[PDB]
Amino acid sequence: IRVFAIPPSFASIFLTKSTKLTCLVTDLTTYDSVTISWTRQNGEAVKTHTNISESHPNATFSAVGEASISEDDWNSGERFTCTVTHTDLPSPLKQTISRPKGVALHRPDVYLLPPAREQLNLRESATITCLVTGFSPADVFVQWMQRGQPLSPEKYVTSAPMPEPQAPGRYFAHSILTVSEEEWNTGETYTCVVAHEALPNRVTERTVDKST
Amino acid sequence: IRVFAIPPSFASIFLTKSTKLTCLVTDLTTYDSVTISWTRQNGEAVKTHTNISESHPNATFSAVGEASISEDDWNSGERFTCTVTHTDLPSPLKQTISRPKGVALHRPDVYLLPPAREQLNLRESATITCLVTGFSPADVFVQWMQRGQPLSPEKYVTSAPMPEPQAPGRYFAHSILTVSEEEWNTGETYTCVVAHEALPNRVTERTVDKST
């Protein structure tokens, strides 16, 4: 009997320029006649959700609810909760969601790594690594750009923010992109751009080519 | 009401040259008078476990049991199960554990990446990446060697085997080690050695220095 909510990730916030709240139901049998409403700390309600979900095929029911809010209150840390009503439960369950500020806010550093000389001898593939170290909190966004045009999210893999051993609280993350030699040796540059909330303009780009 | 077992990882098997089986209890209240025994597919028993565990402080009970076996039967895929007896359960629960063979067995490739030129300008740290791509199944072991002497496992971080987008079934993993510039520019070589069960001798070493 759980209902887990999804706080907005800085990745989505920077990608869409619009803060949403999301919560889903779990550990409950599929049913109907369920209403989802978001209530803030004071008590008043917000815009109505849309896009009613379905039931998972694993004897679990899930409902999704959307609410558009300003980013200032979320950054401040207002207490937010969505309301879920069901049949078996006697009292509707409340799910507290909030983001604090005491988390340190250090700007990260960006490093790009060209492929090894010895990998470009099989003439089959190449790998470029964009390396980000030393940021707090644990929300980062990385994407790859080719000739000013975004690449599909199916050609690169991004690691989750995992802590440095040599620090009390700090993190790092990795991303590698798979291209073809003829492209790397004779193609274009795949800039990696990272967006962190501790950055001045929240945007940082680095460029890597064959002759760097 | 679950009891999850730990199949031997190729990492542990290669590290200790001795195959063990392990199973732990969960989702049960702490109690006593519990016996753990391993039974193979035929029905006969094996050596007695040791090192009785304790109870987790989260209202969960756990028992650990050890059994030493040959590697040939485990590689073949014999059906193995440890027996757990408790008070509330009417019938002892059996936990089936076995490793198959239909998993592909491609040898991996090893790549070492020196630190970026631009990171060695802050004169504060350096990072070396050992990159392993294209192996099956999902069991790998990586460790770092300095002047023939193993380094402590608290100075490097190893990724989990996660699949390549450009392949039906294949994986890769990463590892980065943190050293000091004066060490990297004027120190020794930190060889990364990887052990995979598809390799001929199960051992592969690569060497990287300042002048490579």
PDB file of all heavy atoms in Angstrom, chain A residues 62-85:
ATOM      1  N   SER A  62      -2.114   2.115 -10.981  1.00  0.00           N
ATOM      2  CA  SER A  62      -1.345   3.349 -10.992  1.00  0.00           C
ATOM      3  C   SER A  62      -2.184   4.461 -11.601  1.00  0.00           C
ATOM      4  O   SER A  62      -2.863   4.256 -12.610  1.00  0.00           O
ATOM      5  CB  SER A  62      -0.044   3.183 -11.781  1.00  0.00           C
ATOM      6  OG  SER A  62      -0.312   2.910 -13.145  1.00  0.00           O
ATOM      7  N   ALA A  63      -2.132   5.635 -10.978  1.00  0.00           N
ATOM      8  CA  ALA A  63      -2.776   6.834 -11.495  1.00  0.00           C
ATOM      9  C   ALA A  63      -1.760   7.964 -11.523  1.00  0.00           C
ATOM     10  O   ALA A  63      -0.996   8.144 -10.571  1.00  0.00           O
ATOM     11  CB  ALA A  63      -3.987   7.229 -10.646  1.00  0.00           C
ATOM     12  N   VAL A  64      -1.753   8.727 -12.615  1.00  0.00           N
ATOM     13  CA  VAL A  64      -0.806   9.816 -12.814  1.00  0.00           C
ATOM     14  C   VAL A  64      -1.560  11.139 -12.817  1.00  0.00           C
ATOM     15  O   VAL A  64      -2.646  11.250 -13.398  1.00  0.00           O
ATOM     16  CB  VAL A  64       0.011   9.630 -14.111  1.00  0.00           C
ATOM     17  CG1 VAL A  64      -0.895   9.601 -15.323  1.00  0.00           C
ATOM     18  CG2 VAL A  64       1.051  10.733 -14.250  1.00  0.00           C
ATOM     19  N   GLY A  65      -0.992  12.134 -12.141  1.00  0.00           N
ATOM     20  CA  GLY A  65      -1.594  13.449 -12.054  1.00  0.00           C
ATOM     21  C   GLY A  65      -0.589  14.555 -12.294  1.00  0.00           C
ATOM     22  O   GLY A  65       0.544  14.484 -11.810  1.00  0.00           O
ATOM     23  N   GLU A  66      -0.982  15.576 -13.046  1.00  0.00           N
ATOM     24  CA  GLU A  66      -0.089  16.666 -13.408  1.00  0.00           C
ATOM     25  C   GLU A  66      -0.551  17.973 -12.778  1.00  0.00           C
ATOM     26  O   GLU A  66      -1.751  18.209 -12.615  1.00  0.00           O
ATOM     27  CB  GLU A  66      -0.012  16.821 -14.927  1.00  0.00           C
ATOM     28  CG  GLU A  66       0.869  15.790 -15.611  1.00  0.00           C
ATOM     29  CD  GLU A  66       2.344  16.115 -15.497  1.00  0.00           C
ATOM     30  OE1 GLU A  66       2.680  17.156 -14.897  1.00  0.00           O
ATOM     31  OE2 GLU A  66       3.167  15.335 -16.021  1.00  0.00           O
ATOM     32  N   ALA A  67       0.413  18.819 -12.425  1.00  0.00           N
ATOM     33  CA  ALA A  67       0.124  20.142 -11.881  1.00  0.00           C
ATOM     34  C   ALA A  67       1.273  21.065 -12.242  1.00  0.00           C
ATOM     35  O   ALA A  67       2.431  20.756 -11.949  1.00  0.00           O
ATOM     36  CB  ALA A  67      -0.070  20.088 -10.366  1.00  0.00           C
ATOM     37  N   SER A  68       0.958  22.191 -12.870  1.00  0.00           N
ATOM     38  CA  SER A  68       1.963  23.156 -13.294  1.00  0.00           C
ATOM     39  C   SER A  68       2.082  24.237 -12.227  1.00  0.00           C
ATOM     40  O   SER A  68       1.074  24.814 -11.807  1.00  0.00           O
ATOM     41  CB  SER A  68       1.598  23.768 -14.646  1.00  0.00           C
ATOM     42  OG  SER A  68       2.653  24.568 -15.146  1.00  0.00           O
ATOM     43  N   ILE A  69       3.311  24.500 -11.786  1.00  0.00           N
ATOM     44  CA  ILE A  69       3.586  25.470 -10.736  1.00  0.00           C
ATOM     45  C   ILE A  69       4.748  26.352 -11.173  1.00  0.00           C
ATOM     46  O   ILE A  69       5.466  26.049 -12.127  1.00  0.00           O
ATOM     47  CB  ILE A  69       3.912  24.796  -9.386  1.00  0.00           C
ATOM     48  CG1 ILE A  69       5.175  23.944  -9.512  1.00  0.00           C
ATOM     49  CG2 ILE A  69       2.747  23.949  -8.911  1.00  0.00           C
ATOM     50  CD1 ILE A  69       5.699  23.432  -8.191  1.00  0.00           C
ATOM     51  N   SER A  70       4.916  27.464 -10.463  1.00  0.00           N
ATOM     52  CA  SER A  70       6.095  28.296 -10.652  1.00  0.00           C
ATOM     53  C   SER A  70       7.309  27.616 -10.032  1.00  0.00           C
ATOM     54  O   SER A  70       7.180  26.757  -9.156  1.00  0.00           O
ATOM     55  CB  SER A  70       5.891  29.683 -10.039  1.00  0.00           C
ATOM     56  OG  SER A  70       7.055  30.479 -10.181  1.00  0.00           O
ATOM     57  N   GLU A  71       8.500  27.991 -10.503  1.00  0.00           N
ATOM     58  CA  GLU A  71       9.714  27.392  -9.960  1.00  0.00           C
ATOM     59  C   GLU A  71      10.156  28.053  -8.661  1.00  0.00           C
ATOM     60  O   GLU A  71      10.911  27.440  -7.898  1.00  0.00           O
ATOM     61  CB  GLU A  71      10.829  27.427 -11.019  1.00  0.00           C
ATOM     62  CG  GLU A  71      11.274  28.809 -11.519  1.00  0.00           C
ATOM     63  CD  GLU A  71      12.163  29.574 -10.550  1.00  0.00           C
ATOM     64  OE1 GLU A  71      12.666  28.973  -9.578  1.00  0.00           O
ATOM     65  OE2 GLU A  71      12.409  30.772 -10.798  1.00  0.00           O
ATOM     66  N   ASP A  72       9.700  29.278  -8.388  1.00  0.00           N
ATOM     67  CA  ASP A  72      10.158  29.992  -7.199  1.00  0.00           C
ATOM     68  C   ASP A  72       9.717  29.294  -5.917  1.00  0.00           C
ATOM     69  O   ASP A  72      10.520  29.109  -4.996  1.00  0.00           O
ATOM     70  CB  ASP A  72       9.658  31.437  -7.232  1.00  0.00           C
ATOM     71  CG  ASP A  72      10.119  32.249  -6.032  1.00  0.00           C
ATOM     72  OD1 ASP A  72      11.340  32.475  -5.883  1.00  0.00           O
ATOM     73  OD2 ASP A  72       9.255  32.663  -5.232  1.00  0.00           O
ATOM     74  N   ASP A  73       8.445  28.898  -5.841  1.00  0.00           N
ATOM     75  CA  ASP A  73       7.956  28.214  -4.647  1.00  0.00           C
ATOM     76  C   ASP A  73       8.627  26.859  -4.466  1.00  0.00           C
ATOM     77  O   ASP A  73       8.970  26.476  -3.339  1.00  0.00           O
ATOM     78  CB  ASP A  73       6.436  28.067  -4.719  1.00  0.00           C
ATOM     79  CG  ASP A  73       5.975  27.427  -6.010  1.00  0.00           C
ATOM     80  OD1 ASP A  73       6.032  28.104  -7.057  1.00  0.00           O
ATOM     81  OD2 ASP A  73       5.543  26.256  -5.980  1.00  0.00           O
ATOM     82  N   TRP A  74       8.824  26.118  -5.560  1.00  0.00           N
ATOM     83  CA  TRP A  74       9.495  24.828  -5.456  1.00  0.00           C
ATOM     84  C   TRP A  74      10.927  24.992  -4.970  1.00  0.00           C
ATOM     85  O   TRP A  74      11.402  24.210  -4.139  1.00  0.00           O
ATOM     86  CB  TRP A  74       9.473  24.105  -6.800  1.00  0.00           C
ATOM     87  CG  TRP A  74      10.147  22.773  -6.744  1.00  0.00           C
ATOM     88  CD1 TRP A  74      11.259  22.387  -7.431  1.00  0.00           C
ATOM     89  CD2 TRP A  74       9.746  21.644  -5.962  1.00  0.00           C
ATOM     90  NE1 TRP A  74      11.579  21.089  -7.120  1.00  0.00           N
ATOM     91  CE2 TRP A  74      10.664  20.610  -6.221  1.00  0.00           C
ATOM     92  CE3 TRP A  74       8.699  21.407  -5.068  1.00  0.00           C
ATOM     93  CZ2 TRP A  74      10.568  19.360  -5.617  1.00  0.00           C
ATOM     94  CZ3 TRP A  74       8.606  20.165  -4.470  1.00  0.00           C
ATOM     95  CH2 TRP A  74       9.535  19.157  -4.747  1.00  0.00           C
ATOM     96  N   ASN A  75      11.635  26.001  -5.481  1.00  0.00           N
ATOM     97  CA  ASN A  75      12.991  26.264  -5.015  1.00  0.00           C
ATOM     98  C   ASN A  75      12.990  26.672  -3.547  1.00  0.00           C
ATOM     99  O   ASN A  75      13.892  26.303  -2.788  1.00  0.00           O
ATOM    100  CB  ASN A  75      13.643  27.343  -5.879  1.00  0.00           C
ATOM    101  CG  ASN A  75      15.129  27.488  -5.612  1.00  0.00           C
ATOM    102  OD1 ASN A  75      15.733  26.663  -4.927  1.00  0.00           O
ATOM    103  ND2 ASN A  75      15.727  28.541  -6.157  1.00  0.00           N
ATOM    104  N   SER A  76      11.980  27.442  -3.132  1.00  0.00           N
ATOM    105  CA  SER A  76      11.873  27.837  -1.731  1.00  0.00           C
ATOM    106  C   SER A  76      11.688  26.627  -0.826  1.00  0.00           C
ATOM    107  O   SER A  76      12.297  26.542   0.246  1.00  0.00           O
ATOM    108  CB  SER A  76      10.715  28.817  -1.547  1.00  0.00           C
ATOM    109  OG  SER A  76       9.470  28.140  -1.572  1.00  0.00           O
ATOM    110  N   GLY A  77      10.847  25.682  -1.236  1.00  0.00           N
ATOM    111  CA  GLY A  77      10.627  24.475  -0.469  1.00  0.00           C
ATOM    112  C   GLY A  77       9.242  24.315   0.111  1.00  0.00           C
ATOM    113  O   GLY A  77       9.107  23.720   1.187  1.00  0.00           O
ATOM    114  N   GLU A  78       8.212  24.830  -0.555  1.00  0.00           N
ATOM    115  CA  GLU A  78       6.854  24.730  -0.043  1.00  0.00           C
ATOM    116  C   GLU A  78       6.416  23.272   0.039  1.00  0.00           C
ATOM    117  O   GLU A  78       6.777  22.450  -0.807  1.00  0.00           O
ATOM    118  CB  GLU A  78       5.903  25.517  -0.943  1.00  0.00           C
ATOM    119  CG  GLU A  78       6.131  27.018  -0.943  1.00  0.00           C
ATOM    120  CD  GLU A  78       5.816  27.658   0.393  1.00  0.00           C
ATOM    121  OE1 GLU A  78       4.912  27.157   1.095  1.00  0.00           O
ATOM    122  OE2 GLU A  78       6.472  28.661   0.741  1.00  0.00           O
ATOM    123  N   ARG A  79       5.632  22.957   1.067  1.00  0.00           N
ATOM    124  CA  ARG A  79       5.151  21.599   1.293  1.00  0.00           C
ATOM    125  C   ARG A  79       4.016  21.302   0.319  1.00  0.00           C
ATOM    126  O   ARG A  79       2.989  21.988   0.328  1.00  0.00           O
ATOM    127  CB  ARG A  79       4.679  21.437   2.738  1.00  0.00           C
ATOM    128  CG  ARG A  79       4.148  20.057   3.085  1.00  0.00           C
ATOM    129  CD  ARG A  79       5.246  19.011   3.107  1.00  0.00           C
ATOM    130  NE  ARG A  79       6.207  19.239   4.180  1.00  0.00           N
ATOM    131  CZ  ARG A  79       7.362  18.597   4.301  1.00  0.00           C
ATOM    132  NH1 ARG A  79       7.729  17.667   3.436  1.00  0.00           N
ATOM    133  NH2 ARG A  79       8.166  18.896   5.317  1.00  0.00           N
ATOM    134  N   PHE A  80       4.193  20.270  -0.499  1.00  0.00           N
ATOM    135  CA  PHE A  80       3.254  19.909  -1.554  1.00  0.00           C
ATOM    136  C   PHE A  80       2.861  18.450  -1.393  1.00  0.00           C
ATOM    137  O   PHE A  80       3.673  17.631  -0.951  1.00  0.00           O
ATOM    138  CB  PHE A  80       3.865  20.144  -2.939  1.00  0.00           C
ATOM    139  CG  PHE A  80       4.077  21.593  -3.280  1.00  0.00           C
ATOM    140  CD1 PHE A  80       4.918  21.954  -4.318  1.00  0.00           C
ATOM    141  CD2 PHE A  80       3.464  22.591  -2.548  1.00  0.00           C
ATOM    142  CE1 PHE A  80       5.125  23.282  -4.630  1.00  0.00           C
ATOM    143  CE2 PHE A  80       3.660  23.915  -2.858  1.00  0.00           C
ATOM    144  CZ  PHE A  80       4.494  24.264  -3.898  1.00  0.00           C
ATOM    145  N   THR A  81       1.616  18.130  -1.739  1.00  0.00           N
ATOM    146  CA  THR A  81       1.086  16.780  -1.594  1.00  0.00           C
ATOM    147  C   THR A  81      -0.096  16.582  -2.531  1.00  0.00           C
ATOM    148  O   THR A  81      -0.952  17.465  -2.646  1.00  0.00           O
ATOM    149  CB  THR A  81       0.661  16.518  -0.146  1.00  0.00           C
ATOM    150  OG1 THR A  81       1.806  16.592   0.713  1.00  0.00           O
ATOM    151  CG2 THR A  81       0.015  15.154  -0.013  1.00  0.00           C
ATOM    152  N   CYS A  82      -0.142  15.430  -3.199  1.00  0.00           N
ATOM    153  CA  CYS A  82      -1.291  15.043  -4.007  1.00  0.00           C
ATOM    154  C   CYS A  82      -2.176  14.102  -3.199  1.00  0.00           C
ATOM    155  O   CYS A  82      -1.676  13.305  -2.398  1.00  0.00           O
ATOM    156  CB  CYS A  82      -0.866  14.382  -5.322  1.00  0.00           C
ATOM    157  SG  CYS A  82      -0.002  12.799  -5.196  1.00  0.00           S
ATOM    158  N   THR A  83      -3.487  14.204  -3.403  1.00  0.00           N
ATOM    159  CA  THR A  83      -4.470  13.440  -2.645  1.00  0.00           C
ATOM    160  C   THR A  83      -4.953  12.266  -3.486  1.00  0.00           C
ATOM    161  O   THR A  83      -5.323  12.443  -4.652  1.00  0.00           O
ATOM    162  CB  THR A  83      -5.652  14.318  -2.238  1.00  0.00           C
ATOM    163  OG1 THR A  83      -6.421  14.652  -3.399  1.00  0.00           O
ATOM    164  CG2 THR A  83      -5.160  15.596  -1.579  1.00  0.00           C
ATOM    165  N   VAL A  84      -4.957  11.076  -2.890  1.00  0.00           N
ATOM    166  CA  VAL A  84      -5.409   9.857  -3.548  1.00  0.00           C
ATOM    167  C   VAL A  84      -6.559   9.258  -2.748  1.00  0.00           C
ATOM    168  O   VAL A  84      -6.483   9.134  -1.521  1.00  0.00           O
ATOM    169  CB  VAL A  84      -4.257   8.842  -3.725  1.00  0.00           C
ATOM    170  CG1 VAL A  84      -3.734   8.347  -2.378  1.00  0.00           C
ATOM    171  CG2 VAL A  84      -4.714   7.671  -4.580  1.00  0.00           C
ATOM    172  N   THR A  85      -7.637   8.912  -3.446  1.00  0.00           N
ATOM    173  CA  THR A  85      -8.806   8.293  -2.836  1.00  0.00           C
ATOM    174  C   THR A  85      -9.039   6.929  -3.468  1.00  0.00           C
ATOM    175  O   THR A  85      -8.938   6.778  -4.691  1.00  0.00           O
ATOM    176  CB  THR A  85     -10.048   9.186  -2.972  1.00  0.00           C
ATOM    177  OG1 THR A  85     -11.133   8.623  -2.222  1.00  0.00           O
ATOM    178  CG2 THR A  85     -10.458   9.366  -4.432  1.00  0.00           C
TER     179      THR A  85
END
